[PDB]
Amino acid sequence: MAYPMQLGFQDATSPIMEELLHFHDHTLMIVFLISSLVLYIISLMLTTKLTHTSTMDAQEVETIWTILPAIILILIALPSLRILYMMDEINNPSLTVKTMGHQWYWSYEYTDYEDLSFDSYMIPTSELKPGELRLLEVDNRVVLPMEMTIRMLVSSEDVLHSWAVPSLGLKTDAIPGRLNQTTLMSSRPGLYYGQCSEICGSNHSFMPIVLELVPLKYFEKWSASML
Amino acid sequence: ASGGGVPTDEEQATGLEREVMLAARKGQDPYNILAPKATSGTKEDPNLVPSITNKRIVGCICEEDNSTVIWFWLHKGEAQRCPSCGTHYKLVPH
Amino acid sequence: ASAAKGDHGGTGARTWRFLTFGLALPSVALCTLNSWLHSGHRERPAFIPYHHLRIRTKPFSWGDGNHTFFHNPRVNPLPTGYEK
Amino acid sequence: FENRVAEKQKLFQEDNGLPVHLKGGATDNILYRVTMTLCLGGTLYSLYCLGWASFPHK
Amino acid sequence: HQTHAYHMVNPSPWPLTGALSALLMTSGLTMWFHFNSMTLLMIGLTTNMLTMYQWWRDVIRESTFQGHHTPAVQKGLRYGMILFIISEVLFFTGFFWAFYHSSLAPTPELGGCWPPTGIHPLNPLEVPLLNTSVLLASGVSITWAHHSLMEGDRKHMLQALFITITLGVYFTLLQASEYYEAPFTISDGVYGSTFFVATGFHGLHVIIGSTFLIVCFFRQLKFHFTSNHHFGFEAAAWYWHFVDVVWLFLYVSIYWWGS
Amino acid sequence: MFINRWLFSTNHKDIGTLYLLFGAWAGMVGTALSLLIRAELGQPGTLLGDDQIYNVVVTAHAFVMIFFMVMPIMIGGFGNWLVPLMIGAPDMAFPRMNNMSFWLLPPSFLLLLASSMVEAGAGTGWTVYPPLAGNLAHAGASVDLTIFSLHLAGVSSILGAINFITTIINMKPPAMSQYQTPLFVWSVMITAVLLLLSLPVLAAGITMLLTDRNLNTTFFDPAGGGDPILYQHLFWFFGHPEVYILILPGFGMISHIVTYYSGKKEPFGYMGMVWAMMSIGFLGFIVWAHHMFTVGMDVDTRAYFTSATMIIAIPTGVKVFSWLATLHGGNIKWSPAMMWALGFIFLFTVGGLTGIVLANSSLDIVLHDTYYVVAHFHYVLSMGAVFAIMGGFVHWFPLFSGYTLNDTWAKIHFAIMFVGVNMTFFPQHFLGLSGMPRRYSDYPDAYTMWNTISSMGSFISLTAVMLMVFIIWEAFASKREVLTVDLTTTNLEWLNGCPPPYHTFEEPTYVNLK
Amino acid sequence: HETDEEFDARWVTYFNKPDIDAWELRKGMNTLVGYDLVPEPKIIDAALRACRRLNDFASAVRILEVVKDKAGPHKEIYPYVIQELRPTLNELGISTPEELGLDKV
Amino acid sequence: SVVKSEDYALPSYVDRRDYPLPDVAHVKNLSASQKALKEKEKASWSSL
Numbered sequence A: 001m002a003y004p005m006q007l008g009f010q011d012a013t014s015p016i017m018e019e020l021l022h023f024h025d026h027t028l029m030i031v032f033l034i035s036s037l038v039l040y041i042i043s044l045m046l047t048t049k050l051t052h053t054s055t056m057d058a059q060e061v062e063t064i065w066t067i068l069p070a071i072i073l074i075l076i077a078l079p080s081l082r083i084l085y086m087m088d089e090i091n092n093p094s095l096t097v098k099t100m101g102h103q104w105y106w107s108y109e110y111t112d113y114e115d116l117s118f119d120s121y122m123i124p125t126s127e128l129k130p131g132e133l134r135l136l137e138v139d140n141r142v143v144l145p146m147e148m149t150i151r152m153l154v155s156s157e158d159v160l161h162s163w164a165v166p167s168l169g170l171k172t173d174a175i176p177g178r179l180n181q182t183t184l185m186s187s188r189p190g191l192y193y194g195q196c197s198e199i200c201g202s203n204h205s206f207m208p209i210v211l212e213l214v215p216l217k218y219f220e221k222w223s224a225s226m227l
Numbered sequence B: 001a002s003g004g005g006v007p008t009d010e011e012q013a014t015g016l017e018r019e020v021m022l023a024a025r026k027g028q029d030p031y032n033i034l035a036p037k038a039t040s041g042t043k044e045d046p047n048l049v050p051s052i053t054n055k056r057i058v059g060c061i062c063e064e065d066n067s068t069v070i071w072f073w074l075h076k077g078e079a080q081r082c083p084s085c086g087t088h089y090k091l092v093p094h
Numbered sequence C: 001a002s003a004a005k006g007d008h009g010g011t012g013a014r015t016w017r018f019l020t021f022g023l024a025l026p027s028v029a030l031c032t033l034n035s036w037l038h039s040g041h042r043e044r045p046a047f048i049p050y051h052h053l054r055i056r057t058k059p060f061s062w063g064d065g066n067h068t069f070f071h072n073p074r075v076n077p078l079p080t081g082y083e084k
Numbered sequence D: 001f002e003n004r005v006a007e008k009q010k011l012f013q014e015d016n017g018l019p020v021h022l023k024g025g026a027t028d029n030i031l032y033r034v035t036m037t038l039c040l041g042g043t044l045y046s047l048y049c050l051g052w053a054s055f056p057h058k
Numbered sequence E: 001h002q003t004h005a006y007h008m009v010n011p012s013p014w015p016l017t018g019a020l021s022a023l024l025m026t027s028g029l030t031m032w033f034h035f036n037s038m039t040l041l042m043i044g045l046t047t048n049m050l051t052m053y054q055w056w057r058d059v060i061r062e063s064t065f066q067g068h069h070t071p072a073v074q075k076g077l078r079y080g081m082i083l084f085i086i087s088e089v090l091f092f093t094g095f096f097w098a099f100y101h102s103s104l105a106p107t108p109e110l111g112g113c114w115p116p117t118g119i120h121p122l123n124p125l126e127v128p129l130l131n132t133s134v135l136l137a138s139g140v141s142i143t144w145a146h147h148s149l150m151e152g153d154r155k156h157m158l159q160a161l162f163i164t165i166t167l168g169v170y171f172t173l174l175q176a177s178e179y180y181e182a183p184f185t186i187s188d189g190v191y192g193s194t195f196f197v198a199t200g201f202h203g204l205h206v207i208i209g210s211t212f213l214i215v216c217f218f219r220q221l222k223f224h225f226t227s228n229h230h231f232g233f234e235a236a237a238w239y240w241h242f243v244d245v246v247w248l249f250l251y252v253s254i255y256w257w258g259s
Numbered sequence F: 001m002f003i004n005r006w007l008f009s010t011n012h013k014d015i016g017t018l019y020l021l022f023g024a025w026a027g028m029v030g031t032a033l034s035l036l037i038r039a040e041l042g043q044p045g046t047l048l049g050d051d052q053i054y055n056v057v058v059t060a061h062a063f064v065m066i067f068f069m070v071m072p073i074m075i076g077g078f079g080n081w082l083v084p085l086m087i088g089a090p091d092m093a094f095p096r097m098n099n100m101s102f103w104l105l106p107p108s109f110l111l112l113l114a115s116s117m118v119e120a121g122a123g124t125g126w127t128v129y130p131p132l133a134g135n136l137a138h139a140g141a142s143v144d145l146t147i148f149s150l151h152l153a154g155v156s157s158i159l160g161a162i163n164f165i166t167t168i169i170n171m172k173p174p175a176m177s178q179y180q181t182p183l184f185v186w187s188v189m190i191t192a193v194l195l196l197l198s199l200p201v202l203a204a205g206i207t208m209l210l211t212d213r214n215l216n217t218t219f220f221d222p223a224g225g226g227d228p229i230l231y232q233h234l235f236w237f238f239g240h241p242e243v244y245i246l247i248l249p250g251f252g253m254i255s256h257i258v259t260y261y262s263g264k265k266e267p268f269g270y271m272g273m274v275w276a277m278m279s280i281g282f283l284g285f286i287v288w289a290h291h292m293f294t295v296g297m298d299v300d301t302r303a304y305f306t307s308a309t310m311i312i313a314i315p316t317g318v319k320v321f322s323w324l325a326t327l328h329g330g331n332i333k334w335s336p337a338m339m340w341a342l343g344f345i346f347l348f349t350v351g352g353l354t355g356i357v358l359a360n361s362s363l364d365i366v367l368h369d370t371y372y373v374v375a376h377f378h379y380v381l382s383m384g385a386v387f388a389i390m391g392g393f394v395h396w397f398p399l400f401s402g403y404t405l406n407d408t409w410a411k412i413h414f415a416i417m418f419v420g421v422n423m424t425f426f427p428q429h430f431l432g433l434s435g436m437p438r439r440y441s442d443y444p445d446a447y448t449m450w451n452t453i454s455s456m457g458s459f460i461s462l463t464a465v466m467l468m469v470f471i472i473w474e475a476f477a478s479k480r481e482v483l484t485v486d487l488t489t490t491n492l493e494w495l496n497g498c499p500p501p502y503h504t505f506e507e508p509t510y511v512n513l514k
Numbered sequence G: 001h002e003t004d005e006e007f008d009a010r011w012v013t014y015f016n017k018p019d020i021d022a023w024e025l026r027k028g029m030n031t032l033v034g035y036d037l038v039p040e041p042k043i044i045d046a047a048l049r050a051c052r053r054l055n056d057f058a059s060a061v062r063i064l065e066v067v068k069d070k071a072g073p074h075k076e077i078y079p080y081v082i083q084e085l086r087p088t089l090n091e092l093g094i095s096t097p098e099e100l101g102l103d104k105v
Numbered sequence H: 001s002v003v004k005s006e007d008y009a010l011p012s013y014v015d016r017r018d019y020p021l022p023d024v025a026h027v028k029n030l031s032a033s034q035k036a037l038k039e040k041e042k043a044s045w046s047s048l
């Protein structure tokens, strides 16, 4: 989850999210460098009483400041697209889970074997147990096996929603009539939080997502008990 | 087939359209449709700038293909020079 | 293509009148014959209350709310089937 | 039909200071008044309708 | 007094009455759709027609009767009409995109096929082919009208322009009959939606274009056009060819390929 | 006379003035809505109500700022005032149609205000996506009034585009080619081409939403075989060109301001600037699905849209470097307009660069629908488009009015606004990277510090807006009349005096061919 | 585009034209100061003597001021230029801006 | 001396360090003593 005064991304919980962190570090360095260069050059242009107001020939220097940005863009696009196609690669999941968005909560279906499904609603602020997080906890968490490739399928039974979990690098829109797929793999046990990420009406801010990542044998027994 | 009955512009153009038409036929351009062609622009052979008043704005494209046009009021009297290239212009009021 | 016709020399009013009466209106006449010749009602199919058809998410702003604007009782079933 | 454009040209070029939308004669003023009255009255009516629609009606 | 060739237009009320007619038509549609009443809408449609009539009347006064359409002014009006037609093309492009989006990827609700289960399309070789011949023919006859006008031939201009209008009206009547006879409706899923909204806006433009041709017909009867100056006729002809080409795309896309 | 002049106008300057007044009033509305947003978010918990009232405010904020403030001010206001003067033309091509482009906007605005007064308002986002905006989840008149508001604004701008393109192509001196017209005129021509092509597609999409809501069509409704995502394509096919429409006249004014207060007779690299604006205009039509990287599109389509979007940095970089090269060697005049333009160059660059971050579809999965997007577009809108509007307003106010502003007050105003907007939006990058979603009325507790700071920033910007009103009042109250303006040889719009006469260029300029 | 010496010689020739008129004096000086250089004393000398032929003492002083201005923060250029011009200043009776108190703000 | 609004189309005076010799003199009208001064300026400036 996010923590107070956080500046950057939530710590990565999945290898893909780790890849995104390093790619963001690379891109932000370039962003910093170019912004700072432009600010510096502005100050340089403005700090001399020397003048030169006659016509200036442009041809030579426009080569520099076309070719240099083109090279920089290529230096961004290459790692960007590598991660894109990595995130797309075939992986062979062990488990498929569906989630359906609704106004205003998520339901989950685990129907590889038995017909397991339940609804997952925000815990009202007045009912939080001590130490629980305002607007983030749910009554029924999305229990999942850690260290395993999971296929998430996402849809909606009413308006648009979007199913997100920032620390896993996931955001898949929930569209009625459409079954969108993403894959999820947590390197660690724990609790990982997300929030509805497409405006969906009166309680858009109040339909969060909580994944609970545990060893397979715990997930199996939990699954059985949820039937 | 064939036959007539459609008026011509000669017959039926009126107002400013007709003035422009009749002037063009005489080779004249009172409504500034054409670009004037430059003289050599010396003080001896200044560009001659018609006006219906005693001043008119000139735009000077000093060199072929300059994208910057140099604009100034030209007043009745002694020829004036473009402030960028010095080419001469003289107002001819009428 | 050059089509298969032939003239020019000058494209003029006479040529375009020639095309109008010699090609364009004869073609309209032919298609008018073809059409008013294949008219004659088709059998209306069995009514099936498919959920992707006869959509009603809001009543229409005319009539009883349930009839389309150029409703033809012979061939346009209502959501409950053919009327009357 | 005969070509009466010349007499229309005389009428609409008469030096009377009228704008072109009134230069045909009294019929122009009537049609203008009808148009503007419908527009301004209809606009006031639309504002009443907004007033009506802005509140719940049992 | 000016020494350029452009038109300084007298101060005019029609921009304001046109803008207000747009307010009345849109608030009128809202009232019709949500408050079961046509009153505002009928006022808006009326003031809209009044505005268009007086505005274009004044343009005729300014040009035919007052002589303000110099060649430079006409050239601006040519660009204006071409740009207007371009915006109309892009408007139709949105509906063709909707049609291809839905028909190339038919969803499970349709049966996963195009045409959808339960849709029985019109035969594109019957009235739709007839309406294609009708608009193509009108494109030939309006070209005859144009050449007759340029050659100074009043009678054959009027004959050809009358034939063009008659064909425009024929198309509209055929299309109205096909709308009544069609066994599917605008509420028949995305097939009906795309069919009737796209051909419906096209039919509206045929009516607009026919009205514009009729205006030209009565102006021609009153000798407004010269053999060299007749931009209103040229504009109505360009608009008419645009209506014909949109029909050809509809016929190939929706009636034929989409059947 | 008053009605003839101000309701029946066929004069490009008076119609420009009408647009500037309309846009200034809209700007107050938009500012109030922005303060309501930030009041709701300025402490954790709920201030106003749930997300419906909150997102009616957000939705209106955006529509007002975009369609009633920026576009009327830049295109209707500076465009009508300056374009005919900069080409020596005696008015616009269609001076009477021009007046209708203006008068469609008060009705469009009335329709938007009506949408928020009836039922529970249109709480949809300015993107108006179905099915939230459809007749089940937004039953009643509000969304239809919004659609009609957009229809009228769209007609206004399409007819305005026709006017500007025709005027700029057809009404220059016969010797002046397109490559002798000023960059602001180019910027308006290209913006008008974008308006002409993109707005009809928006009109098509929102008409389909209207018929899905009222005539039982199903363009966007799966039950009929429709698709919500089709709406998104049609909307963004307009919506990406629209953001270039919002900035391009700003680029044009920045070129004139930087050139003028550098003491230069011309911008550096004129044909490069023309090339860059045309390139940006063209590329802005082939990138729209970067608004759709999380909707489930195939990976090769995501790779194409990532790459095509990033290319626009190259022409845009040529413009930024050319502005810097215009400053180079200048006799710099530190006028208030120059300060706006310098702040523009830097802060626009920052927002353009976070836009390049977002163009990477892999990273956009995590940034999409978060405040990192909000930060990107307020750097280019609140510190780009707005800074160009303020710079142009302070630079050309003496031309339009004949009176001078107090330059010390104008510099104070710039200083306050600069602090305010940066305090508002810079922390929103942190909120975005750390996962705060868009269109939320309340947030998990961890996000409190940056939301508090951001809201405090928005109040500083409010103080700047109030001070702007006083500064305009003080200028009209004191009546310091303009005497001499420098550099008129390369700024033709000043050469008829301040304010210019009602009719200018009744006798056209003389320009020979040589 | 040319050698420095060719540039300076063109400018000396320009100002040395015997019947140079007031417009050409101003055009010359206002064009020259647009370049990225402080004009060589030999150019300034020719401009000052043009001022003399045009009976314009004030413009001669102004030309010395614009030499100082074009040097910017390089405070060594203007005293060097004046040093090089002192024979001409004395011959023509041209007082410097400093001698006239015109360097006071 | 006094600049007027109705003078906007005439060459004007400006103080700009990059336009050292403006298009007009700051003062156009001369008193008797100022006329005598301009005459004296035609003689050696060493005598001023």
Ligand code: HEA
Pocket: A034, A038, A068, A069, A070, A072, A073, F127, F243, F244, F246, F247, F290, F291, F309, F310, F312, F313, F314, F316, F317, F318, F320, F348, F349, F350, F351, F352, F353, F354, F355, F356, F358, F359, F360, F364, F367, F368, F369, F373, F376, F377, F380, F381, F384, F385
């Ligand atoms: C003035 C308005 C404006 C402008 C000009 C831009 C310009 C750009 N925008 Fe922006 N954008 C918006 C307004 C604007 N945007 C809005 C309103 C939204 C949100 C819509 C909504 O959902 O409500 C948005 C959303 C948006 C998204 C969607 C993100 C998401 O929703 O998840 C993306 C993704 O690619 C994007 C990218 C860019 C890019 C690459 C540019 C480029 O044009 C920027 C190019 C500029 C530079 C790069 C800086 C100058 C260049 C140099 C100094 C050269 C060297 C630089 C490099 C080598 C990189 N924008």
Ligand code: HEA
Pocket: F020, F023, F024, F027, F028, F030, F031, F034, F035, F037, F038, F058, F059, F061, F062, F063, F065, F066, F069, F070, F073, F124, F125, F126, F127, F374, F378, F381, F382, F385, F386, F389, F390, F393, F421, F424, F437, F438, F439, F440, F441, F458, F461, F462, F465
């Ligand atoms: C031009 C566009 C523009 C501008 C200028 C602004 C300015 C501001 N915006 Fe907004 N904003 C949007 C367009 C804009 N915004 C859009 C498109 C959205 C997305 C909507 C959606 O999600 O659907 C958005 C969303 C948005 C949000 C996110 C809401 C959410 O996700 O829940 C927030 C929150 O802080 C915000 C705040 C502000 C603030 C505090 C300002 C302040 O900086 C405003 C300060 C005041 C000014 C800048 C004055 C403006 C007035 C003038 C310039 C008149 C000048 C007068 C003369 C020239 C005479 N905006």
Ligand SMILES: CCCCC/C=C\C/C=C\C/C=C\C/C=C\CCCC(=O)O[C@H](COC(=O)CCCCCCCCCCCCCCCCC)COP(=O)(O)OCCN
Pocket: C068, C069, C070, C071, C072, C076, E029, E171, E172, E173, E175, E176, E179, E180, E181, E182, E183, E184, E185, E186, E187, E196, E197, E199, E200, E201, E203, E204, F151, F154, F155, F200, F203, F207, F211, F215
């Ligand atoms: C040639 C013969 C036909 C000619 C054209 C006839 C009508 C054209 C009217 C306008 C067309 C514009 C689109 C309106 C949308 C739908 C009309 C589609 C065409 C039509 O007429 O569709 C009819 C339905 O009309 C209906 O719902 C309701 C029809 C009336 C309601 C119109 C609602 C207002 C539409 C809003 C317009 C917004 C425009 C914005 C433009 C902005 C541009 C910048 C089909 O009838 P049906 O009974 O369903 O099936 C036949 C069964 N036998």
Ligand SMILES: CCCCCC/C=C\CCCCCCCCCC(=O)O[C@H](COC(=O)CCCCCCCCCCCCCCC)COP(=O)(O)OC[C@@H](O)CO
Pocket: E007, E009, E018, E019, E021, E022, E025, E026, E048, E051, E052, E055, E058, E059, E062, E063, E068, E073, E077, E080, E081, E084, E087, E088, E091, F093, F094, F095, F096, F097, F098, F148, F151, F152, F155, F158, F162, F199, F200, F203
């Ligand atoms: C949901 C319902 C929403 C409804 C919204 C409706 C809103 C608008 C109400 C419209 C009222 C229209 C009244 C008639 C306007 C005629 C304009 C015209 O004809 O403008 C002409 C220029 O535009 C030209 O040519 C070429 C351009 C002609 C355009 C004609 C009008 C088009 C209006 C609709 C445009 C829709 C665009 C659709 C495509 C997306 C003439 O320009 P003027 O400056 O007048 O004169 C110049 C003088 O020299 C002439 O002698």
Ligand SMILES: C[C@H](CCC(=O)O)[C@H]1CC[C@H]2[C@@H]3[C@H](O)C[C@@H]4C[C@H](O)CC[C@]4(C)[C@H]3C[C@H](O)[C@]12C
Pocket: A059, A062, A063, A064, A066, F271, F272, F275, F318
């Ligand atoms: C040829 C054309 C106009 C030149 C003129 O007629 O004045 C110029 C103007 C801007 C130029 C372009 C811009 O300077 C940007 C690019 C700069 C690179 O150095 C070459 C390609 C590059 C894409 C240039 C190609 C070409 O020289 C352009 C397109």
Ligand SMILES: C[C@H](CCC(=O)O)[C@H]1CC[C@H]2[C@@H]3[C@H](O)C[C@@H]4C[C@H](O)CC[C@]4(C)[C@H]3C[C@H](O)[C@]12C
Pocket: E097, E101, F230, F233, F289, F300, F301, F304
């Ligand atoms: C996004 C749009 C489909 C819109 C729709 O669903 O209605 C589709 C239609 C045609 C597509 C393009 C064409 O298929 C051609 C290219 C194919 C490449 O694999 C991706 C880029 C590429 C350039 C495509 C991008 C995108 O998928 C496009 C533009």
Ligand code: CUA
Pocket: A101, A102, A104, A160, A161, A162, A196, A197, A198, A199, A200, A201, A203, A204, A205, A207
């Ligand atoms: Cu569900 Cu937002």
Ligand SMILES: [O-][O-]
Pocket: F239, F240, F243
């Ligand atoms: O839109 O960026």
Ligand SMILES: [Cu+2]
Pocket: F239, F240, F243, F287, F288, F290, F291
């Ligand atoms: Cu975009």
Ligand SMILES: [Mg+2]
Pocket: A162, A197, A198, F294, F368, F369
């Ligand atoms: Mg989203």
Ligand code: NA
Pocket: F040, F041, F042, F043, F044, F045, F046, F047, F441, F442, F443
């Ligand atoms: Na809150």
Ligand SMILES: [Zn+2]
Pocket: B060, B061, B062, B063, B070, B082, B083, B084, B085, B086, B087
């Ligand atoms: Zn010149």
